[PDB]
Amino acid sequence: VWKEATTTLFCASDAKAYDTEVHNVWATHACVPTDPNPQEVKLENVTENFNMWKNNMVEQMHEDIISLWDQSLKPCVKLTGGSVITQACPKVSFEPIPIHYCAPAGFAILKCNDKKFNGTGPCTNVSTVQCTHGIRPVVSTQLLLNGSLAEEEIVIRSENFTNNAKTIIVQLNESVVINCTRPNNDIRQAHCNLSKTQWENTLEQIAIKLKEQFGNNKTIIFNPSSGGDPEIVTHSFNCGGEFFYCNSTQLFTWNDTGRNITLPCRIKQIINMWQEVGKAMYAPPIRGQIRCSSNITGLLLTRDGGNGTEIFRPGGGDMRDNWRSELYKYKVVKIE
Amino acid sequence: XNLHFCQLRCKSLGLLGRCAXTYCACV
Ligand SMILES: *[C@@H]1O[C@H](CO)[C@@H](O)[C@H](O)[C@H]1NC(C)=O
Ligand SMILES: *[C@@H]1O[C@H](CO)[C@@H](O)[C@H](O)[C@H]1NC(C)=O
Ligand SMILES: *[C@@H]1O[C@H](CO)[C@@H](O)[C@H](O)[C@H]1NC(C)=O
Ligand SMILES: *[C@@H]1O[C@H](CO)[C@@H](O)[C@H](O)[C@H]1NC(C)=O
Ligand SMILES: *[C@@H]1O[C@H](CO)[C@@H](O)[C@H](O)[C@H]1NC(C)=O
Ligand SMILES: *[C@@H]1O[C@H](CO)[C@@H](O)[C@H](O)[C@H]1NC(C)=O
Ligand SMILES: *[C@@H]1O[C@H](CO)[C@@H](O)[C@H](O)[C@H]1NC(C)=O
Ligand SMILES: *[C@@H]1O[C@H](CO)[C@@H](O)[C@H](O)[C@H]1NC(C)=O
Ligand code: NA
Ligand code: NA
Ligand code: NA
Ligand code: NA
Ligand code: NA
Ligand code: NA
DSSP states (O other): OOEEOOOOOEEEEOOOTTOOSHHHHHHHHHEEEOOSSOOEEEOTTOOEEEETTSOHHHHHHHHHHHHHHHHHOOOSEEEETTEEEEOOOOOOOOOOOOBEEEOOTTEEEEEEOOTTOOSEEEESSEEEESBOOOBOOOOBSSEEESOOOOSSSOEEEOSOTTOTTSOEEEEEEEEEEEEEEEOOOOTTEEEEEEEHHHHHHHHHHHHHHHHHHHOTTOEEEEOOOOOBSHHHHTEEEEETTEEEEEOOTTTSOBOOOOOEEEEEEEEESEEEOSSSSSEEEOOOOOSSOEEEEEEEEEEEEEEOOOOOEEEEEEOOOOHHHHHHHHHTTEEEEEOO | XOHHHHHHHHGGGTOOEEEETTEEEEO
16 A cells, blocks of 8 residues: 655646746746646545645645745845845736646655545545646635636535634635726725625525534524734735735625625735745836636635534635645555 | 734734734634
């Protein structure tokens, strides 16, 4: 039996050397071309344990995306541990591309194909793949964007549902498009639009899955963030190199008992960093229309915990959960 | 994350603080 093991996976992508967009530039030096001859082999009569919450693939991806951002998006001023650094801070072209992670000789990536798979415990439909599927390294809070959908029903996953401190990762089975724009010609005012009925239906179906986990006698409530850094109180993300902070109150105020939801957003120059504890200042926004149309494919939630009612709030912050939301079906083993 | 200052901030909303990665979250 092949044992789980750590190695440096290599990355593969469709990056182009003639594209100045920063993910492309990073991948042109860090990665190889996307596998021209992918091969998935089913492992007959094999049952394998997985644990999405303890997976070194996540840690490697995290370090890679930190490196990508550090090389690519330079702040004008950075404050870490009382120390200030200043440097040139040019605007860049920024649009994530899919990255695949690949096993080098002596190692294999195992993939769980079980339909209901919660990320931990035994998998009965296991295959080997030369590389993962292509994952866009989207850095965001609250909502997971441009990811992969659950094939059948919505799936919710947690390291321990009974522990209210553990994040719940929701995987949708139907994308909800969200369009965010800072219009052409207040240069920091922006907004996001999404279908009201689609979002309401989404919340209803998530609530059903939550009741299935916590008790059908339970009443499910969504409420906004309880507070903290603006990055986690809002739905925050990077669009076109600019940092958007979108008020998500309307998304997360719901109970069981207009065509579009319009979320107000602000582009901020001073951000709390996700890569390390500290703050960074970037330059004011570029001119012109700044717009991103994204698929909402998942959510990060916390549950209040602590009678008869369960309250859930938008969460996130630790980007390792973003990577886990795509890497949950994979593990690396040593061939012996 | 700065946990102490995170804690120092959240209590003023009536709340405990904890890290969410490199971010401060109130509970
Ligand atoms: C196992 O997973 C594969 C991949 O999704 C699927 O095609 C197949 O039908 C599943 N069931 C098997 C192999 O019995
Ligand atoms: C958005 O979702 C649709 C299906 O809902 C899919 O066809 C499309 O490829 C997705 N876009 C991205 C960037 O993943
Ligand atoms: C998505 O999953 C929900 C249950 O979670 C189900 O009711 C719905 O029909 C599914 N939609 C699709 C397109 O599979
Ligand atoms: C994952 O599923 C297995 C089997 O269905 C179960 O034993 C385990 O408790 C689940 N993990 C959770 C709920 O974290
Ligand atoms: C899940 O969390 C609860 C609360 O912290 C704990 O009592 C329980 O033992 C945990 N379950 C595990 C670690 O399997
Ligand atoms: C998002 O933009 C697309 C075109 O890019 C449009 O077809 C769609 O209706 C928009 N969605 C919302 C909710 O405005
Ligand atoms: C977020 O939106 C809600 C609902 O309109 C509003 O009460 C709240 O003040 C907004 N937050 C900020 C920081 O403006
Ligand atoms: C989602 O994917 C589309 C298509 O590549 C892109 O235009 C959009 O900027 C992406 N969203 C984010 C937040 O990266
Ligand atoms: Na990115
Ligand atoms: Na995301
Ligand atoms: Na709020
Ligand atoms: Na992005
Ligand atoms: Na908000
Ligand atoms: Na760093």
